[PDB]
Amino acid sequence: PTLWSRVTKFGSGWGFWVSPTVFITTTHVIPTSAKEFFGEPLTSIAIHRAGEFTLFRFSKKIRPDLTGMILEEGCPEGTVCSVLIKRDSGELLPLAVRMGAIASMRIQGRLVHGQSGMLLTGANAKGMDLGTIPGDCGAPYVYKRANDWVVCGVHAAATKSGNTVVCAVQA
Amino acid sequence: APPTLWSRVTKFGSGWGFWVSPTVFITTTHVIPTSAKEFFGEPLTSIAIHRAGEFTLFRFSKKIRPDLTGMILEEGCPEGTVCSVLIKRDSGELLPLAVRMGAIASMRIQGRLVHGQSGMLLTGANAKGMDLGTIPGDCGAPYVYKRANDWVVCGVHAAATKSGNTVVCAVQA
Ligand SMILES: Cc1cc(C)nc(Nc2ccccc2)n1
């Protein structure tokens, strides 16, 4: 049983299974030409979109092996989350991120709305596995609270250089 | 982390070890099978074993891994270095866990006395457990970092605290 099995390749990025019927992803990674996802006709899928956050609700159990997890609209300011990055090499890269305010941020000359964060893996990556790349979009932000895992949004954007990431949130 | 570093990470006893070169293999002392008299088809007589607490180095008299180039092994790393711990998990999943390294330390963990280079995981806030932190089966995994153009190995995974936020790298002496 693992959080990592819920992280799924999707479109030009990734998404996350909250429950057997609920999948979350970043809006800009979703295909714009499709009649089905995960073998289910698009006719039978409810799509709920809020800026860079999208939630799919399926009419049957796609992932019956999973329990349902707590999904919230962001997290309290100062919470340290993990972004659960999968790479096509087969690497799993959990990175600590300190979450800040909900904001409109200028990220490579474009406006992105969501919960700001700062990577805690330090000055740079180099060739080291310490930062995000554009193909990581849709990876989930998670943290542990009491005995429960909480999912609070999806990876939407990052500055090419610095420290700053945007986590798109529900509602 | 480069494929050539993952290729050197080898399942061994109750954990792992790592090929520095075609003749040199390093691991954590407590993962070695205690009754073993043969390694990679070679008897004990043809191997030079150098043990310093939880760090063990095996030097073979023939080339076991001729596919490999020899790389740099150092005695830990500067304080503040960020390393990756190259951990293999159930099913060809590769977990290069980020760790900020600190001072050489003597600690008591689950009653055992442990000595090596301390570090703190950079994977999340509460790293107890297998999704963001280490498990006992990870002992012997290598600590590596990139220094300008090349990669360095600076120890092997020896222990983690009950909270899982602190780890100890056993180092060559
Ligand atoms: C940069 C910074 C400032 C402050 C106040 N807290 C933290 N938290 C932290 C850092 C690494 C791992 C886990 C938590 N980080």
Author numbering:
A (entry chain B): 3 to 173
B (entry chain A): 1 to 173
Which sentences did the original study use to describe this structure?
Viral replication requires a 3C-like cysteine protease (3CLpro) which processes the 200 kDa viral polyprotein into six functional proteins. The 3C-like protease (3CLpro) was named because of its similarity to the picornavirus 3C protease. It is a cysteine protease which shows a typical chymotrypsin-like fold containing two domains: a β-barrel domain and a β-sheet domain separated by a groove where the active site is located. The active site is characterised by a catalytic dyad (Cys139-His30) or triad (Cys139-His30-Glu54) and shows a strong preference for a –D/E-F/Y-X-L-Q-G-P- (X can be H, Q, or E) sequence corresponding to the subsites S5-S4-S3-S2-S1-S1′-S2′. The key role of norovirus 3CLpro in the processing of the polyprotein and the absence of homologues in the human host make it an excellent target for antiviral drug discovery.
